[PDB]
Short mmCIF file of C-alpha atoms in Angstrom, two decimals:
data_model
loop_
_atom_site.label_atom_id
_atom_site.label_comp_id
_atom_site.label_asym_id
_atom_site.label_seq_id
_atom_site.Cartn_x
_atom_site.Cartn_y
_atom_site.Cartn_z
CA UNK A 1 -10.64 26.30 -62.03
CA UNK A 2 -14.42 26.67 -61.75
CA UNK A 3 -16.78 24.03 -63.18
CA UNK A 4 -17.96 26.49 -65.84
CA UNK A 5 -14.45 27.81 -66.54
CA UNK A 6 -13.33 24.26 -67.37
CA UNK A 7 -16.21 23.42 -69.70
CA UNK A 8 -15.66 26.74 -71.53
CA UNK A 9 -12.17 25.39 -72.34
CA UNK A 10 -13.27 21.87 -73.19
CA UNK A 11 -15.88 23.01 -75.70
CA UNK A 12 -13.31 25.09 -77.56
CA UNK A 13 -11.13 22.10 -78.39
CA UNK A 14 -14.27 20.53 -79.85
CA UNK A 15 -13.47 22.55 -82.99
CA UNK A 16 -10.91 20.51 -84.96
CA UNK A 17 -10.02 23.59 -87.02
CA UNK A 18 -8.62 25.29 -83.93
CA UNK A 19 -5.31 27.11 -84.50
CA UNK A 20 -2.47 24.96 -83.13
CA UNK A 21 -1.25 27.87 -80.97
CA UNK A 22 -4.62 28.41 -79.25
CA UNK A 23 -4.92 24.65 -78.82
CA UNK A 24 -1.47 24.29 -77.25
CA UNK A 25 -2.07 27.21 -74.88
CA UNK A 26 -5.51 25.91 -73.89
CA UNK A 27 -4.00 22.51 -73.14
CA UNK A 28 -1.33 24.41 -71.21
CA UNK A 29 -4.10 25.99 -69.14
CA UNK A 30 -5.48 22.52 -68.46
CA UNK A 31 -2.02 21.36 -67.36
CA UNK A 32 -1.20 24.22 -64.97
CA UNK A 33 -4.75 24.16 -63.59
CA UNK A 34 -4.79 20.40 -62.99
CA UNK A 35 -1.35 20.72 -61.39
CA UNK A 36 -2.67 23.59 -59.25
CA UNK A 37 -5.61 21.59 -57.92
CA UNK A 38 -3.49 18.50 -57.31
CA UNK A 39 -1.24 20.72 -55.18
CA UNK A 40 -4.25 22.31 -53.45
CA UNK A 41 -5.85 18.93 -52.78
CA UNK A 42 -2.65 17.46 -51.35
CA UNK A 43 -2.29 20.53 -49.15
CA UNK A 44 -5.82 19.87 -47.92
CA UNK A 45 -5.08 16.24 -47.13
CA UNK A 46 -2.01 17.33 -45.16
CA UNK A 47 -3.95 20.07 -43.35
CA UNK A 48 -6.87 17.75 -42.61
CA UNK A 49 -4.27 15.34 -41.27
CA UNK A 50 -3.04 18.06 -38.92
CA UNK A 51 -6.46 18.90 -37.51
CA UNK A 52 -7.07 15.19 -37.00
CA UNK A 53 -3.93 14.97 -34.89
CA UNK A 54 -4.64 18.09 -32.87
CA UNK A 55 -8.09 16.65 -32.24
CA UNK A 56 -6.44 13.48 -30.95
CA UNK A 57 -4.34 15.53 -28.53
CA UNK A 58 -7.05 17.93 -27.40
CA UNK A 59 -9.27 15.02 -26.42
CA UNK A 60 -6.51 13.59 -24.22
CA UNK A 61 -6.04 17.04 -22.70
CA UNK A 62 -9.74 17.51 -21.94
CA UNK A 63 -10.00 14.04 -20.37
CA UNK A 64 -6.96 14.66 -18.17
CA UNK A 65 -8.45 17.99 -17.17
CA UNK A 66 -11.74 16.31 -16.23
CA UNK A 67 -9.82 13.90 -14.01
CA UNK A 68 -7.75 16.71 -12.52
CA UNK A 69 -11.04 18.54 -11.99
CA UNK A 70 -12.86 15.62 -10.33
CA UNK A 71 -10.28 15.06 -7.64
CA UNK A 72 -9.91 18.79 -7.10
CA UNK A 73 -13.67 18.98 -6.52
CA UNK A 74 -13.51 16.29 -3.83
CA UNK A 75 -10.37 17.67 -2.22
CA UNK A 76 -12.37 20.85 -1.64
CA UNK A 77 -15.06 18.73 0.02
CA UNK A 78 -12.78 18.19 3.04
CA UNK A 79 -14.13 20.84 5.41
CA UNK A 80 -14.05 24.62 5.56
CA UNK A 81 -12.69 26.23 8.72
CA UNK A 82 -14.42 24.02 11.29
CA UNK A 83 -13.32 20.56 10.15
CA UNK A 84 -9.79 21.90 9.71
CA UNK A 85 -9.08 22.64 13.34
CA UNK A 86 -11.22 19.66 14.33
CA UNK A 87 -8.29 17.54 13.07
CA UNK A 88 -5.96 19.11 15.62
CA UNK A 89 -8.50 17.98 18.19
CA UNK A 90 -7.57 14.58 16.83
CA UNK A 91 -3.78 14.95 16.51
CA UNK A 92 -3.40 15.32 20.26
CA UNK A 93 -6.26 13.11 21.28
CA UNK A 94 -3.76 10.72 19.71
CA UNK A 95 -0.49 12.15 21.04
CA UNK A 96 -2.03 11.47 24.41
CA UNK A 97 -2.70 7.78 23.75
CA UNK A 98 0.64 7.61 21.93
CA UNK A 99 2.61 8.22 25.12
CA UNK A 100 0.05 6.66 27.50
CA UNK A 101 0.27 3.34 25.64
CA UNK A 102 4.07 3.45 25.63
CA UNK A 103 4.50 4.81 29.15
CA UNK A 104 2.38 1.96 30.49
CA UNK A 105 4.22 -0.61 28.35
CA UNK A 106 7.69 0.65 29.32
CA UNK A 107 6.33 0.35 32.84
CA UNK A 108 5.07 -3.18 32.09
CA UNK A 109 8.62 -4.44 31.40
CA UNK A 110 9.83 -2.43 34.39
CA UNK A 111 7.47 -5.08 35.75
CA UNK A 112 9.30 -7.62 33.55
CA UNK A 113 12.59 -7.48 35.42
CA UNK A 114 10.95 -6.35 38.68
CA UNK A 115 9.48 -9.82 38.29
CA UNK A 116 12.81 -11.48 37.31
CA UNK A 117 14.57 -10.00 40.31
CA UNK A 118 12.49 -12.43 42.38
CA UNK A 119 11.79 -15.42 40.04
CA UNK A 120 15.59 -15.83 39.99
CA UNK A 121 15.67 -14.99 43.69
CA UNK A 122 13.00 -17.62 44.37
CA UNK A 123 15.13 -20.21 42.61
CA UNK A 124 18.00 -19.32 44.95
CA UNK A 125 15.55 -19.97 47.76
CA UNK A 126 13.86 -23.08 46.35
CA UNK A 127 17.12 -24.99 46.24
CA UNK A 128 18.95 -24.28 49.50
CA UNK A 129 15.65 -24.86 51.29
CA UNK A 130 15.39 -28.25 49.60
CA UNK A 131 19.03 -28.76 50.63
CA UNK A 132 18.22 -28.21 54.32
CA UNK A 133 15.10 -30.35 53.97
CA UNK A 134 17.23 -33.09 52.43
CA UNK A 135 19.74 -32.79 55.30
CA UNK A 136 17.13 -33.20 58.03
CA UNK A 137 15.55 -36.05 56.07
CA UNK A 138 18.95 -37.71 55.98
CA UNK A 139 19.32 -37.45 59.75
CA UNK A 140 15.70 -38.49 60.16
CA UNK A 141 16.01 -41.74 58.22
CA UNK A 142 19.37 -42.65 59.73
CA UNK A 143 17.61 -42.41 63.09
CA UNK A 144 14.61 -44.17 61.61
CA UNK A 145 16.75 -46.96 60.19
CA UNK A 146 18.03 -47.46 63.73
CA UNK A 147 14.52 -47.32 65.25
CA UNK A 148 13.68 -50.35 63.15
CA UNK A 149 15.21 -53.74 64.06
CA UNK A 150 14.61 -52.84 67.73
CA UNK A 151 10.84 -52.74 67.20
CA UNK A 152 10.66 -55.83 69.41
CA UNK A 153 9.47 -53.11 72.39
CA UNK A 154 11.53 -50.46 74.20
CA UNK A 155 9.23 -47.79 75.73
CA UNK A 156 11.56 -44.90 74.82
CA UNK A 157 12.12 -46.26 71.32
CA UNK A 158 8.35 -46.67 71.06
CA UNK A 159 7.74 -42.97 71.74
CA UNK A 160 10.53 -42.07 69.29
CA UNK A 161 8.90 -44.36 66.69
CA UNK A 162 5.58 -42.68 67.46
CA UNK A 163 7.35 -39.39 66.67
CA UNK A 164 8.79 -40.71 63.39
CA UNK A 165 5.32 -41.29 61.92
CA UNK B 1 -9.06 10.78 -59.80
CA UNK B 2 -6.28 9.71 -62.17
CA UNK B 3 -2.63 10.64 -61.63
CA UNK B 4 -1.14 13.65 -63.50
CA UNK B 5 0.99 11.40 -65.75
CA UNK B 6 -2.21 9.86 -67.13
CA UNK B 7 -3.76 13.31 -67.44
CA UNK B 8 -0.62 14.28 -69.31
CA UNK B 9 -0.51 11.45 -71.84
CA UNK B 10 -4.18 12.23 -72.42
CA UNK B 11 -3.19 15.85 -73.07
CA UNK B 12 -0.72 14.58 -75.68
CA UNK B 13 -3.58 12.95 -77.55
CA UNK B 14 -5.15 16.36 -78.18
CA UNK B 15 -2.26 18.34 -79.69
CA UNK B 16 -2.36 16.16 -82.80
CA UNK B 17 -3.46 18.74 -85.43
CA UNK B 18 -5.86 16.32 -87.16
CA UNK B 19 -6.65 13.54 -84.67
CA UNK B 20 -9.74 11.38 -85.24
CA UNK B 21 -12.69 13.48 -84.04
CA UNK B 22 -14.30 10.60 -82.12
CA UNK B 23 -11.07 10.22 -80.15
CA UNK B 24 -11.09 13.96 -79.50
CA UNK B 25 -14.62 13.91 -78.07
CA UNK B 26 -13.68 10.79 -76.06
CA UNK B 27 -10.66 12.57 -74.62
CA UNK B 28 -12.52 15.76 -73.74
CA UNK B 29 -15.24 13.65 -72.13
CA UNK B 30 -12.58 11.81 -70.13
CA UNK B 31 -11.21 15.13 -68.92
CA UNK B 32 -14.64 16.51 -67.94
CA UNK B 33 -15.61 13.37 -66.04
CA UNK B 34 -12.25 13.19 -64.28
CA UNK B 35 -12.52 16.84 -63.28
CA UNK B 36 -16.07 16.33 -62.04
CA UNK B 37 -14.76 13.49 -59.88
CA UNK B 38 -11.79 15.50 -58.59
CA UNK B 39 -14.11 18.38 -57.76
CA UNK B 40 -16.61 16.20 -55.94
CA UNK B 41 -13.98 14.40 -53.85
CA UNK B 42 -12.35 17.72 -53.07
CA UNK B 43 -15.72 19.11 -51.98
CA UNK B 44 -16.03 16.10 -49.69
CA UNK B 45 -12.59 16.79 -48.24
CA UNK B 46 -13.54 20.45 -47.81
CA UNK B 47 -16.72 19.36 -45.98
CA UNK B 48 -14.78 17.02 -43.66
CA UNK B 49 -12.02 19.58 -43.11
CA UNK B 50 -14.50 22.33 -42.26
CA UNK B 51 -15.97 19.91 -39.75
CA UNK B 52 -12.69 19.52 -37.88
CA UNK B 53 -12.43 23.30 -37.89
CA UNK B 54 -15.71 23.45 -35.99
CA UNK B 55 -15.00 20.75 -33.46
CA UNK B 56 -11.63 22.42 -32.85
CA UNK B 57 -13.37 25.63 -31.76
CA UNK B 58 -15.69 23.64 -29.50
CA UNK B 59 -12.86 21.76 -27.80
CA UNK B 60 -10.65 24.84 -27.46
CA UNK B 61 -13.48 26.54 -25.58
CA UNK B 62 -14.01 23.44 -23.46
CA UNK B 63 -10.43 23.38 -22.25
CA UNK B 64 -10.64 27.11 -21.49
CA UNK B 65 -13.72 26.19 -19.50
CA UNK B 66 -12.22 23.24 -17.61
CA UNK B 67 -8.93 25.01 -16.82
CA UNK B 68 -10.77 27.91 -15.26
CA UNK B 69 -13.03 25.61 -13.23
CA UNK B 70 -9.98 23.69 -12.11
CA UNK B 71 -8.29 26.82 -10.85
CA UNK B 72 -11.48 27.79 -9.05
CA UNK B 73 -11.60 24.48 -7.19
CA UNK B 74 -7.88 24.64 -6.46
CA UNK B 75 -8.52 28.08 -4.98
CA UNK B 76 -11.58 27.15 -2.91
CA UNK B 77 -9.70 24.19 -1.48
CA UNK B 78 -6.62 26.30 -0.89
CA UNK B 79 -8.58 29.08 0.82
CA UNK B 80 -10.25 26.55 3.08
CA UNK B 81 -6.84 25.48 4.35
CA UNK B 82 -5.55 22.66 2.16
CA UNK B 83 -1.85 22.63 2.92
CA UNK B 84 -2.30 22.77 6.68
CA UNK B 85 -5.26 20.38 6.58
CA UNK B 86 -3.46 17.60 4.73
CA UNK B 87 -0.42 18.28 6.92
CA UNK B 88 -2.63 17.30 9.85
CA UNK B 89 -3.70 14.13 8.04
CA UNK B 90 0.02 13.50 7.56
CA UNK B 91 0.34 13.58 11.33
CA UNK B 92 -2.93 11.86 12.27
CA UNK B 93 -2.02 8.78 10.23
CA UNK B 94 1.59 8.79 11.47
CA UNK B 95 0.48 8.90 15.10
CA UNK B 96 -2.20 6.27 14.46
CA UNK B 97 0.59 4.17 12.95
CA UNK B 98 3.19 4.20 15.71
CA UNK B 99 0.43 4.13 18.35
CA UNK B 100 -0.77 0.98 16.62
CA UNK B 101 2.85 -0.22 16.81
CA UNK B 102 3.04 0.26 20.58
CA UNK B 103 -0.44 -1.15 21.13
CA UNK B 104 0.87 -4.27 19.37
CA UNK B 105 4.15 -4.65 21.28
CA UNK B 106 2.34 -3.83 24.55
CA UNK B 107 -0.33 -6.38 23.73
CA UNK B 108 2.49 -8.94 23.28
CA UNK B 109 4.58 -8.48 26.46
CA UNK B 110 1.41 -8.09 28.48
CA UNK B 111 0.36 -11.42 26.91
CA UNK B 112 3.51 -13.43 27.42
CA UNK B 113 4.49 -12.36 30.89
CA UNK B 114 1.49 -12.52 33.20
CA UNK B 115 2.02 -15.64 31.21
CA UNK B 116 5.52 -15.41 32.89
CA UNK B 117 4.74 -14.70 36.43
CA UNK B 118 2.41 -17.63 37.11
CA UNK B 119 5.85 -19.10 37.68
CA UNK B 120 6.34 -16.94 40.78
CA UNK B 121 2.89 -18.01 41.95
CA UNK B 122 4.25 -21.50 41.37
CA UNK B 123 7.81 -20.94 42.62
CA UNK B 124 6.49 -19.28 45.77
CA UNK B 125 4.39 -22.40 46.29
CA UNK B 126 7.52 -24.52 45.83
CA UNK B 127 9.34 -22.47 48.46
CA UNK B 128 6.69 -22.89 51.13
CA UNK B 129 5.81 -26.56 51.01
CA UNK B 130 9.52 -27.40 50.83
CA UNK B 131 9.94 -25.01 53.73
CA UNK B 132 7.17 -26.94 55.50
CA UNK B 133 8.99 -30.24 54.96
CA UNK B 134 12.13 -28.66 56.41
CA UNK B 135 10.38 -27.16 59.41
CA UNK B 136 8.50 -30.43 59.72
CA UNK B 137 11.50 -32.76 59.76
CA UNK B 138 13.49 -30.44 62.01
CA UNK B 139 10.57 -30.38 64.41
CA UNK B 140 10.50 -34.16 64.68
CA UNK B 141 14.26 -34.28 65.10
CA UNK B 142 14.22 -31.77 67.94
CA UNK B 143 11.24 -33.63 69.40
CA UNK B 144 13.33 -36.78 69.58
CA UNK B 145 16.16 -34.72 71.05
CA UNK B 146 13.88 -33.64 73.87
CA UNK B 147 12.93 -37.26 74.51
CA UNK B 148 16.64 -38.06 74.82
CA UNK B 149 17.00 -35.26 77.36
CA UNK B 150 14.03 -36.77 79.21
CA UNK B 151 15.90 -40.00 79.94
CA UNK B 152 16.99 -40.86 83.48
CA UNK B 153 19.27 -43.76 82.61
CA UNK B 154 22.57 -43.64 80.77
CA UNK B 155 22.11 -43.95 77.01
CA UNK B 156 21.47 -47.54 75.96
CA UNK B 157 23.80 -48.16 72.93
CA UNK B 158 20.90 -47.63 70.52
CA UNK B 159 19.75 -44.39 72.14
CA UNK B 160 23.41 -43.35 72.42
CA UNK B 161 23.79 -43.78 68.65
CA UNK B 162 20.57 -41.85 68.05
CA UNK B 163 21.73 -39.04 70.35
CA UNK B 164 25.10 -39.06 68.56
CA UNK B 165 23.19 -38.47 65.33
CA UNK B 166 21.22 -35.67 66.98
CA UNK B 167 23.87 -33.10 66.25
CA UNK B 168 23.34 -30.97 63.14
#
C-alpha cells in the first residue's frame, strides 16, 4: 500500500464511533496489506540474494576469460608465416647434429674395442717377452756366477767378464 | 520492522469497540511508524537491488566482449599456423633433448678412454724396453759364444761348463 493510502486508513480508526464492521474490515485491509508487503520484501531479499550470487560467478568468469585472453594474445605473438618455417630450418639443423654427434660417438667406441684388441694383445706380448728376457738373464747369471771365483786372471775369462758388464 | 505476530496482537488492540482513546492513538502511531520504517528499508533494498541489476548488464556485456576478443586471437594465431608451429616446437625440444643426451654420453666415453689408451702408450713402452733387455742379454750371450768359438785350446773345465750353458 502507498504511504498516503495507509494514512487514509489510519485516520479513519481515529474515530472511536466507527461502526464495528467498517473497523474490522479496515483492520483486515491492514492485515492483508502488511502480509502482502512482508511477502514482497522477502521475495526481494531472495532475488537480491540471487543477483549477488550471479555477480559472484560472473566475476570469476570474466577473470578466467581475461587469463584465457592474455595467453591467447601472446600465443599469437609467435610469428606469422616467416618465423613458422624458420623453425623447420632449426628442426634439421638439429637432426644433423643429432646423428653427427651419435655417429662420431658410436665410432669413438668402435675406437674403444679397436683399442682393446691391442691393449690385451700388448699384455700377451709384455709377458712372454719378459719370459724370454728372464730366460736369458738366467743363463747370463749362471755364466756370470761361474765367471766369478776365477777372477784371479784368465785372459779368456777376462774378456768374457768384460762382456758381462 | 516488527514481525507479523506483533503486528497482529497490535491489530487485536484496535477491534475493542470502546478501547481507551489514548491507547488507540498510541496503536495507530505505532502502525504508522512501523510502516514508515518498513517502507524506508524496502526502498533501500530496492535501491541496492536495482544496483545489482545495473552491474549485471555491465558484466554481461563485458563477457560478450572478452569472448569475442578471445575468439579473434584464437583465430589470428590459428591462421598464422599454430598447430604446425607448436608441432615444430614439439620436435625442436625433443631433438635438443636426445642430442643433449648423446653429447653427454659422448663427452663421457671420450673423457674416460683417451683416459684409457695412455695405457697403450705405456704398455707399448713396456714391450720395447723389456724387448731391449731381451735383445741385450741375448747379444751378450751370443758374444760369449763367439769367444768360445775363438778358442784354440780344448775347453778348460770352467770354459767347458760355460760352453755347456751356452745352449738355449
